[PDB]
Design a protein around this ligand. Structure first.
Ligand code: PC1
Ligand code: PC1
Ligand code: PC1
Ligand code: PC1
Ligand code: PC1
Ligand code: PC1
Ligand code: 3PE
Ligand code: 3PE
Ligand code: 3PE
Ligand code: 3PE
Ligand code: PLC
Ligand code: SF4
Ligand code: SF4
Ligand code: SF4
Lengths: 156, 97, 101, 70, 378, 176, 316
């Protein structure tokens, strides 16, 4: 069996393991956290996709920025991102985290959590419905499914 | 009595999907092996089912097509593959397919 | 010998899992990241030790019931347990089993 | 439904069943189809060691009966 | 004393003498967004959604407080059918808040299961929101002059079906908490507040009634049609967290009692004030009448002018007295809008209620105050 | 009217005292709680099978913004900027000029979907039903730029969802 | 053949621990009106495998430990002792037939406390050390009642041999003569394993000591913790729910014994979904002011009861 075939399969196995065990750390800052709690509620039950309800920052694989990010809070958000073991992904939930939202022009609001941390998925809405957030998480799984770390390593 | 009829409903789910192979296909794609009433099929291959004995929210479902717009969707099904005409019915915004 | 093998196997497996748990992820090459004594806690540990020493004297009770001096054996068995109860009663009434400062 | 929890419990049940079944079967394999001899006290060990000398082959589980007496 | 800067949208700087708490210093502003300053740049209609996002568990109650304040300055009166919908969705919104308050309070201290049961009921009340306004949480439905749209046909039947089964849901919550000794140990005699201290520290809502103070703005200073519905006001006797918990559970029961009457007494008629200089005209008549089109154009570009004056309007929101000090200069944009969040005064008293308790009790006290930092920080 | 929640006097007769002693020693009320969780184990869970089943919505649902046309294909928007003036988040930027045939039309119609609060005030303020909030709520992107819509994107959404937008408006315009 | 026996015990223990995580997430799910893992494999059967692979290929934090020698010792000790408490268990035949098997299990269980205390040092954080101390105080306190309760039960058995508890219950379960001790033994097992409502380590808003670990080393503590839950519930069934042992059909014992241990293991999940969490001082006052007075009184009653009924069990 060629090396390009073994590495192709190993990518699927590790990609499958990582997207099937996405443990999120939720930064519940504002109203968008209430819709995040409704994704864990029986109606949608994020836990059945392998997404544990609450995970500690040192066990989490994805950070969900759910709510307005103010200047006072931005340093503590970066401090939690830097302490997250890799691979680490970031999901921006709602307009406030996306690009400032209703409070875009406020003196105390970070106009988008994507100028403090890198973002992998943007979920639009004020708030996004519990189903629209679940679409983002499932969209992050497909993004992780397309990763080719081992294949790219084998061609260096 | 009802105990024996429960095990018979489980068996006829295998026959209602078209044999063991069809039964396993919907178990690994949709994680669900209920049998519903085929309400229609769209031009892309999605099949729409209903069962009004299921509680609200589970009485309408879509088994996505295995290929849409040239993309292999056997495992990669996405909620956005439902066309607008069936979007309204599948979300209970109307009663008419 | 059987027991020694079992102990060696369990801890050998535990050690191997730990070493390959600190280095298997290092097969991946991730970017370099850069960057008051409380007297109440002590009292609990000491009380446990003393109560754990009086348990040591109670462990041979199942063998003690086999004697022909049951009157003497039963008297001293209840003596040790009762004094163990007096030890608890003393700390209880002296506010020793409390956590409010 | 609730009975969809059984597949996980059955796997966990099978896993907890192997240690008991495996130990019982290995003992009979290693002791000629009998239970492994239990020697908690010196008297039991003394008889077991004697069986080792009486059996011919250096095996305590090989029992010799009336056919071994003249 | 050991100091713990717990940090994160709540930062508590506590000094502990072992297990006990000596000083508690809440640090807020982690969700300060300048809502009060932004409103000064928005017309009175554009500012309405800002009130959904203050206490984002009691959205339509906040909308009602701002609608009453503006209507008072406008000197207009919403029609009777709008006031029955506002009371109806005022009490549906109290159920949404109390489910969140009681169950997150229970979730924080270990009881995780009641959270899921009662959030299937919240997911069904969010459908009422989405059916009258198209939004699950931030409806923007209650507006000065009435409400935005009439109830869709078939809605009140579903609310009846929901209200029919809800009393059993509360009874299951109480089978888990009320008589549970572990739950009584975590709340009984925790955070005792004397009646005189509660008044001086600016408390309101259950924080007052849990200490025996007989006060509820729905019965003392009624608004909308709250004087046309019969209900009882729970009153505690010990001032502890357990009494406040019982008060919140009993209010959920009295809300089903008010909801049962709003459905039966719902009247017919228009749902927004029949005064096209305040409320927009109907779309059908906006496309056929010159006056209706002019007013539609002006109401949505400039807004309506509010006569000069200042008012402090308060309502009995689920978390307590929620009010707005609204100052009008005579233009279409408010000059000043101070928002009085009930949780702002409650949180300021956390240092007092927590005096002499263990660290694990500060979690129970915060839950009993029912603090949402959208309204504290504003 | 008011009522007391916790103002009962526990009876101190021997039978009642022994009832509470049995409750304390035999954990009766704790087992009563285990009964409630046991019952839920045997109920049907409320979970739906997303994405194969979707949560129920109504015609009024405020989702992705979209620009509509007349049955002839002509755009409904005539560049009146009422949506721009009402938008509480200032998410709409409009420019307009006389078209080649002399019609009043926009040469720019951008909605920053990251400033928008999905309030629906735009579809209320439009006098020609041009800008609407459609029923799609699944359009999360992988980058911030993909949520800055322009006129081309918004027109495409209208052509995409016109089959469902028209039926939702038909079922709700009588409440408006 | 003995080495095969050891692996026939170790591997299924870990596999059972892997699928106890799936069972816990689904039994909790249905008690909360939802499903739990049902997407990753049929009925979530591959969920434990995905979580296991994902954890062991994630970067470990490994912060600046105070020692770095207690950081490796702690997980090794935790998982080594958890596997070592199974070798004397009769199911129905022990891997190692110890004469003092009951006392051996008490001794090893007491050594497991060092795993908490060594990881608290390695954390290098004062607050992480405070949490470890509270966990040690809770653990040592509640093994005072385990020892005395266990001693009381053995006075009806006659020795420390685990396989003698099978004979002692050949006519009747020990749950009947000693249900008061059974109630206090079950709760002590919950408190020993830091299980709800006694889980202060995982009890956020108050305190975990094993927080600097992640990915792999975290999974080693987790496997050890979940291996003791099964072991404690296996011990409970042997001690209070004895199964009849037919020497010609030993698999009948294992099937019945396995079912009892699963039901007790699921009761641990049943309890976690039903109750709120104790405060630290409240679970100390439960042991020192409620359980210990009763455990001492029942110990006296059980030394004297066999003597006054002429029911002293055989020494051998
Ligand atoms: C015990 C722990 C240590 C185990 C070490 C590794 C040995 C165990 C391997 C177990 C393999 C599990 C993979 C199962 C994937 C699956 O079930 O289907 C998921 C998916 C299912 O589709 P999906 O997950 O993309 O979509 C899910 C969404 N619905 C439900 C709508 C479908 O199938 C795949 O296409 C994933 C491809 C995975 C390919 C893995 C090949 C590995 C070959 C062996 C490599 C060498 C091994 C060393
Ligand atoms: C216990 C039960 C679980 C047992 C573990 C089962 C795991 C099964 C898969 C093992 C093999 C894959 C693990 C390594 C994959 C790590 C990875 O994704 O990155 C690849 C890495 C990526 O290397 P890279 O060169 O592309 O990038 C590294 C530097 N950065 C990221 C900054 C650019 O390459 C490898 O080291 C793979 C080694 C060969 C593996 C065979
Ligand atoms: C799975 C198969 C189905 C059966 C599974 C077992 C179900 C066990 C839980 C059922 C709960 C039913 C609710 C109930 O009856 O509780 C209320 C009842 C009464 O609760 P109560 O507190 O409301 O009673 C009021 C009367 N006074 C004031 C006197 C208390 O609970 C009980 O009566 C149980 C008491 C006995 C418990 C003794 C435990 C000893 C340990 C023995 C170990 C074996
Ligand atoms: C190695 C990694 C660290 C292991 C720590 C755990 C040690 C296991 C407990 C010690 C053995 C034991 O108690 O067996 C009782 C049991 C008690 O069983 P018994 O009392 O029923 O007697 C068995 C034989 N009959 C019944 C016939 C009399 O002892 C035995 O069963 C056999 C005795 C063998 C003695 C050989 C022991 C050598 C190893 C001991 C030192 C271990 C080093 C520790 C290093 C420091 C860490 C603490
Ligand atoms: C209240 C909350 C905590 C409660 C925890 C309850 C879970 C623990 C299990 C309680 C029920 C007892 C186990 C029943 C299933 C055992 C099946 C079995 O072993 O065979 C039937 C067993 C057969 O008997 P046996 O094999 O268990 O042995 C009986 C021993 N003698 C003969 C001495 C009585 O009988 C039953 O369990 C009927 C009940
Ligand atoms: C003829 C002679 C006979 C002699 C023997 C006589 C015995 C008579 C009966 C004595 C009473 C029985 C003692 C039972 C133990 C009581 C412990 C106690 O102190 O309770 C008070 C304690 C606390 O009491 P408290 O907090 O309410 O108040 C204590 C006292 N004051 C008021 C002063 C503070 O209750 C608890 O233990 C709480 C339990 C924690 C939650 C655990 C959930 C339990 C779930 C059910 C599990 C069922 C067990 C299954 C076992 C299966 C095993 C196989
Ligand atoms: C049998 C003993 C029965 C008596 C039980 C005594 C323990 C009772 C609990 C202790 C609390 C109490 O009841 O009062 C004890 C009293 C404390 O002093 P007091 O003035 O009452 O108030 C507190 C002042 N700081 O004063 C005391 O503290 C004295 C009691 C503590 C010392 C225990 C001595 C018990 C007597 C010995 C009994 C066992 C026989 C030992 C024989 C040894 C001979 C070698
Ligand atoms: C599934 C629905 C219920 C949910 C699951 C419940 C929990 C799981 C069930 C409990 C765990 C039991 C798992 C093992 C059961 C399957 C194996 C079995 O039935 O027994 C097989 C046993 C082996 O026979 P053997 O030891 O080889 O004897 C050879 C002598 N010539 O043959 C025998 O002797 C048995 C007599
Ligand atoms: C036994 C049933 C008979 C009985 O107890 O007497 C009932 C009698 C009527 O009740 P009542 O009118 O309230 O009398 C008490 C007023 N002081 O009440 C009586 O007058 C009975 C005498 C009152 C004093 C009884 C004290 C009972 C509690 C002492 C502790 C008993 C502990 C037993 C062991 C508990 C563990 C199982
Ligand atoms: C039928 C008739 C049955 C007999 C009658 C019953 C026996 C009479 C005594 C029963 C009452 C016991 C004393 C008592 O009730 O005092 C309670 C008191 C509680 O104080 P506390 O809990 O700290 O206050 C908290 C307030 N928030 O407690 C205290 O202040 C101190 C309590 C210390 C108790 C010692 C506990 C260890 C003793 C365990 C019993 C073992 C047997 C003792 C030896 C008996 C010899 C025969
Ligand atoms: C020991 C740690 C693992 C070493 C892997 C290795 O070196 O495996 C190498 C071989 C192929 O050999 P190669 O072409 O020389 O690759 C050498 C490495 N390069 C290509 C980066 C230079 O990878 C395989 O076939 C699949 C490996 C899975
Ligand atoms: S995006 Fe909307 S729901 Fe989310 S925090 Fe901002 S205002 Fe609240
Ligand atoms: S929904 Fe509201 S905020 Fe969003 S574009 Fe339309 S008017 Fe502006
Ligand atoms: S979309 Fe409607 S409101 Fe906005 S500019 Fe065009 S016509 Fe005017």
């Amino acid at each position: 069996s060629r090396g390009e075939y073994v590495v192709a399969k190993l990518d699927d196995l590790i990609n499958w393991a990582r997207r099937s065990s996405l443990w999120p750390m939720t930064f519940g800052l504002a109203c968008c956290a209430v819709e995040m709690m409704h994704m864990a509620a029986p109606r949608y039950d994020m836990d059945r996709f392998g997404v544990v309800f609450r995970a500690s920052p040192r066990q989490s694989d994805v950070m969900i920025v759910a709510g307005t990010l103010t200047n006072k809070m931005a340093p503590a958000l970066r401090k939690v991102y830097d302490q997250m073991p890799e691979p680490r992904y970031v999901v921006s939930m709602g307009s406030c985290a996306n690009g400032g939202g209703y409070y875009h022009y406020s003196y105390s609001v970070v106009r988008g959590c994507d100028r403090i941390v890198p973002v992998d998925i943007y979920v639009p809405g004020c708030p996004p419905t519990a189903e629209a957030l679940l679409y983002g998480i499932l969209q992050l799984q497909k993004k992780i499914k397309r990763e080719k770390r081992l294949r790219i390593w084998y061609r260096r | 009595m009802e105990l024996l009829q429960v095990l018979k409903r489980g068996l006829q789910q295998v026959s209602g999907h078209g044999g063991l192979r069809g039964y396993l296909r919907v178990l690994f794609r949709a994680n669900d092996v209920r049998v519903g009433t085929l309400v229609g099929e769209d031009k892309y291959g999605n099949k729409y089912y209903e069962d009004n004995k299921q509680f609200f929210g589970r009485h309408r479902w879509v088994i996505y097509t295995t290929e849409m717009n040239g993309k292999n969707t056997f495992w990669d099904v996405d909620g956005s593959m439902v066309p607008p005409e069936w979007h309204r019915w599948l979300h209970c915004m109307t009663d008419d397919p | 010998m059987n027991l020694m093998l079992a102990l060696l196997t369990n801890f050998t497996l535990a050690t191997l899992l730990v070493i390959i748990a600190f280095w298997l992820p290092q097969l991946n090459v991730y970017s370099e990241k850069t960057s008051p004594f409380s007297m109440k806690f002590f009292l609990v540990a000491i009380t446990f030790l003393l109560f754990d020493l009086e348990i040591a004297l109670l462990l041979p009770l199942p063998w003690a019931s086999q004697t022909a001096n049951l009157n003497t054996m039963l008297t001293m068995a209840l003596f040790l347990i009762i004094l163990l109860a007096v030890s608890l009663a003393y700390e209880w009434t002296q506010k020793g089993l409390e956590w409010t400062e | 439904m609730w009975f969809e929890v059984l597949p996980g419990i059955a796997v966990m049940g099978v896993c907890l069943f192997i240690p008991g079944m495996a130990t019982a079967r290995i003992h009979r394999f290693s002791n000629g189809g009998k239970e492994k001899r239990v020697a908690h006290y010196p008297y039991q060990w003394y008889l077991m060691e004697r069986d080792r000398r009486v059996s011919g082959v250096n095996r305590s589980y090989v029992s010799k009966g009336l056919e071994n007496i003249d | 004393n050991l100091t713990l800067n717990f940090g994160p949208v709540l930062r508590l700087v506590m000094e502990l003498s072992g297990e006990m708490v000596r000083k508690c210093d809440p640090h807020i502003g982690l969700l300060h967004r300048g809502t009060e300053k932004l409103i000064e740049y928005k017309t009175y209609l554009q500012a309405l959604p800002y009130f959904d996002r203050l206490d984002y568990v009691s959205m339509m109650c906040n909308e009602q407080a701002y609608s009453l304040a503006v209507e008072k300055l406008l000197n207009i009166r919403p029609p009777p059918r709008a006031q029955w919908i506002r009371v109806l969705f005022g009490e549906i919104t109290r159920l949404l808040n109390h489910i969140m308050a009681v169950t997150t309070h229970a979730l924080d201290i270990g009881a995780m299961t009641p959270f899921f049961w009662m959030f299937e009921e919240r997911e069904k009340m969010f459908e009422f929101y989405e059916r009258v306004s198209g939004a699950r949480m931030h409806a923007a439905y209650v507006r000065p002059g009435g409400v935005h749209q009439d109830l869709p046909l078939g809605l009140m039947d579903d609310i009846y079906e929901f209200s029919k089964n809800f009393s059993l849901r509360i009874d299951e919550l109480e089978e888990m908490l009320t008589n549970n000794r572990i739950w009584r140990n975590r709340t009984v005699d925790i955070g005792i507040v004397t009646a005189e201290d509660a008044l001086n520290y600016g408390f309101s809502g259950v924080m007052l009634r849990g200490s025996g103070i007989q006060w509820d703005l729905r019965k003392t200073q009624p608004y909308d049609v709250y004087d046309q519905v019969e209900f009882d006001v729970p009153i505690g006797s010990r001032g502890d967290c357990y009494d406040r918990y019982l008060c919140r559970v009993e209010e959920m029961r009295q809300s089903i009692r008010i909801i049962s009457q709003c459905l039966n007494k719902m009247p017919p008629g228009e749902i927004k004030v029949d005064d096209a200089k305040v409320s927009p005209p109907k779309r059908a008549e906006m496309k056929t009448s010159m006056e209706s089109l002019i007013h539609h154009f002006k109401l949505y570009t400039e807004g309506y002018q509010v006569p000069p004056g200042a008012t402090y309007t308060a309502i009995e929101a689920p978390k307590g007295e929620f009010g707005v000090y609204l100052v009008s200069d005579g233009s279409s944009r408010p000059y000043r809008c101070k928002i009085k969040a009930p949780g702002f005064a409650h949180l300021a008293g956390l240092d007092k209620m927590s005096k002499g308790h263990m660290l694990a009790d500060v979690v129970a006290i915060i839950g009993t105050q029912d603090i949402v930092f959208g309204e504290v920080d504003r | 009217t008011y009522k007391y929640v916790n103002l009962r006097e526990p009876s101190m007769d021997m039978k009642s005292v022994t009832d509470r002693a049995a409750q304390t020693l035999l954990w009766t009320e704790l087992i009563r709680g285990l009964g409630m969780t046991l019952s839920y184990l045997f109920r049907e869970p409320a979970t739906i099978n997303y994405p194969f089943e979707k949560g129920p919505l109504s015609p009024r649902f405020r989702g992705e913004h979209a620009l509509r046309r007349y049955p002839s294909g002509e755009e409904r928007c005539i560049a009146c900027k009422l949506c721009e003036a009402v938008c509480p988040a200032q998410a709409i930027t409009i420019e307009a000029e006389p078209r080649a045939d002399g019609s009043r039309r926009t040469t720019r119609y951008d909605i920053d979907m990251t400033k928008c609060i999905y309030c629906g005030f735009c579809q209320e303020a439009c006098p020609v039903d041009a800008i609407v909030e459609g029923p799609n709520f699944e359009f999360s992107t992988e980058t911030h730029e993909e949520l800055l819509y322009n006129k081309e994107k918004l027109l495409n959404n209208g052509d995409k969802w016109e089959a469902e937008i028209a039926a939702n408006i038909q079922a709700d315009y009588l409440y408006r | 053949m003995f080495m095969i026996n050891i692996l026939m015990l170790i591997i299924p223990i870990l596999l059972a621990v892997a699928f106890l995580t799936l069972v816990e997430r689904k039994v909790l799910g249905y008690m909360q009106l939802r499903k739990g893992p049902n997407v990753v494999g049929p009925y979530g059967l591959l969920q434990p495998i995905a979580d296991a692979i994902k954890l062991f290929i994630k970067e470990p934090l490994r912060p600046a430990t105070s020692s770095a020698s207690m950081f490796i010792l702690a997980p090794i000790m935790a998982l080594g002792l958890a596997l070592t408490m199974w070798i004397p268990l009769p199911m129905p035949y022990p891997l190692i037939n110890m004469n003092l098997g009951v006392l051996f299990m008490l001794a090893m269980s007491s050594l497991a406390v060092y795993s908490i205390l060594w990881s608290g040092w390695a954390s290098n954080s004062k607050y992480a050390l405070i949490g470890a101390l509270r966990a040690v105080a809770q653990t040592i306190s509640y093994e005072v009642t385990l020892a005395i309760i266990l001693l009381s039960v053995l006075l009806m058995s006659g020795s420390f041999t685990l396989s003698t508890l099978i004979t002692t219950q050949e006519q009747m379960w020990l749950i009947l003569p000693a249900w008061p001790l059974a109630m206090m033994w079950f709760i002590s097992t919950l408190a020993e394993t830091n299980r709800a409502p006694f889980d202060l380590t995982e009890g956020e808003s108050e305190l975990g000591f094993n927080v600097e670990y992640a990915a792999g080393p975290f999974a080693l503590f987790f496997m050890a913790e979940y291996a003791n839950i099964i072991m404690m519930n296996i011990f409970t069934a042997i001690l209070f729910l004895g199964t009849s042992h037919n020497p010609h059909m030993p698999e009948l014992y294992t099937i019945n014994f396995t079912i009892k241990s699963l039901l007790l293991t699921m009761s641990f999940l049943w309890i976690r979904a039903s109750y709120p969490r104790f405060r630290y001082d409240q679970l100390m006052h439960l042991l020192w002011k409620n359980f210990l007075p009763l455990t001492l009184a029942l110990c006296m009653w059980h030394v004297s009861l066999p003597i006054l009924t002429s029911g002293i069990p055989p020494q051998t």
